[PDB]
Amino acid sequence: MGVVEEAHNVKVIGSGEATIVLGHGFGTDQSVWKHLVPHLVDDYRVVLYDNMGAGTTNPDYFDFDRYSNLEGYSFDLIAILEDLKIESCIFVGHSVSAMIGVLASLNRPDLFSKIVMISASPRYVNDVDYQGGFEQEDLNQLFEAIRSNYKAWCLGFAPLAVGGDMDSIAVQEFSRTLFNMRPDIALSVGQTIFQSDMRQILPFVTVPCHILQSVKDLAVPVVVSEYLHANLGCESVVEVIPSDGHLPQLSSPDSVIPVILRHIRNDI
Ligand SMILES: O=C1C=C[C@H](Cc2ccc(-c3ccccc3)cc2[N+](=O)[O-])O1
């Protein structure tokens, strides 16, 4: 493939028009989809890619100005879609990737037939009329910990994000992918994500959105899902899952994958 496909570790599995693109969240890579993809390959052409700055990607390619906001990531996504001659896709977006997909669909709604979000949020920071999950002081202690001692921060953060049992295979995997990130890049992407505010553009979305989340998610209070549902400008549905964790498609696939598959496979 071309430089931008190689740079993002693009995998394409299968052929056909019916296509699904899967974007991962901060701290992991395309391997977060390992339990979902086996259920998709028989009906869809499956596109996987890593966000720039993931531990699987070349740090020389991490342009701190390009990725200073979410639009830098949406331009990457669009470029991959165009490079792959993809005319229309179902986009499954995990965590920040949910809003990267929303951004891309504002510029190219023709490219997306629907967006399935998992663990999405347009705004993490609380204000007097919006519960996001974090007070600004929460963030400060985060950037202070990451900056202080990254490795230690990875070990501590991974079980809280994955949730569930602390001895799990998923906590193992995530702490690894978290730690393979270059500490300055991890920091820079952290700021961009946590300082993001997608709330004001939601009304302009014109693609149907399925809003999925763990009922217990350290980074996404359940009211966020309802906020998204109430302010998105196209049709949308919410389904809160009886699961624990920010990466439930990895950590609790038995209860989580069937829900994701229902929302991929069926329309509103
Ligand atoms: O991107 C996001 C924002 C919130 C959720 C969960 C989350 C993911 C990633 C990170 C993070 C990773 C590496 C370095 C710094 C921060 C932190 C959180 N968090 O605080 O909750 O996803």
Numbering used by the authors: 1 to 268
Authors' description from the paper:
Karrikin Insensitive 2 (KAI2) proteins are plant α/β-hydrolases with dual receptor-enzyme function that perceive smoke-derived karrikins (KARs) and an endogenous, yet undiscovered, KAI2 ligand (KL). Upon ligand binding, KAI2 is activated and interacts with its target proteins, including MAX2 and SMAX1, which initiate the physiological responses. KAI2 and D14 are α/β-hydrolases containing a Ser-His-Asp catalytic triad in their hydrophobic substrate-binding pockets, and therefore both proteins display hydrolytic activity toward various SL analogs, including GR24, desmethyl-GR24, and debranones compounds. Activation of KAI2 is thought to require hydrolysis of the ligand; however, this has not been experimentally proven.
6′-Carba-dMGer, in which the phenol ether oxygen of dMGer was replaced by a CH2 group, was also designed as a chemical tool that cannot form a covalent adduct with KAI2 because the butenolide ring does not dissociate from the biphenyl moiety. To elucidate the molecular interaction of KAI2 with the (+)-dMGer analogs, we analyzed the crystal structure of the KAI2–(+)-6′-carba-dMGer complex. We examined only the KAI2–(+)-6′-carba-dMGer complex because we were unable to crystallize the KAI2–(+)-dMGer and KAI2–(+)-1′-carba-dMGer complexes. The electron density map indicated that the KAI2-(+)-6′-carba-dMGer crystal structure was composed of two conformers: The ligand was bound in conformer A, whereas the ligand was not observed in conformer B. In conformer A, the butenolide ring of (+)-6′-carba-dMGer faced toward the bottom of the catalytic pocket, while the nitrobiphenyl moiety was oriented toward the access groove of the pocket and was partially exposed to the solvent. Additionally, the orientation of the side-chain phenyl ring of Phe26 in KAI2 was shifted in conformer A compared with apo-KAI2 and conformer B. The phenyl ring of Phe26 probably formed a π–π interaction with the phenyl ring of (+)-6′-carba-dMGer in conformer A. In conformer A, the butenolide ring of (+)-6′-carba-dMGer formed a strong hydrogen bond network with Phe26, Ser95, Tyr124, and His246 that was mediated by two water molecules. However, the O-1′ atom, not the 5′-carbonyl oxygen, was oriented toward the catalytic serine, probably because of the methylene group introduced instead of the phenol ether oxygen of (+)-dMGer. This orientation of the butenolide ring may prevent nucleophilic attack from the serine and explain the nonhydrolyzability of (+)-6′-carba-dMGer. In addition, analysis of the crystal structure of KAI2–(+)-6′-carba-dMGer indicated that (+)-6′-carba-dMGer bound to the catalytic pocket of KAI2 in an intact state.
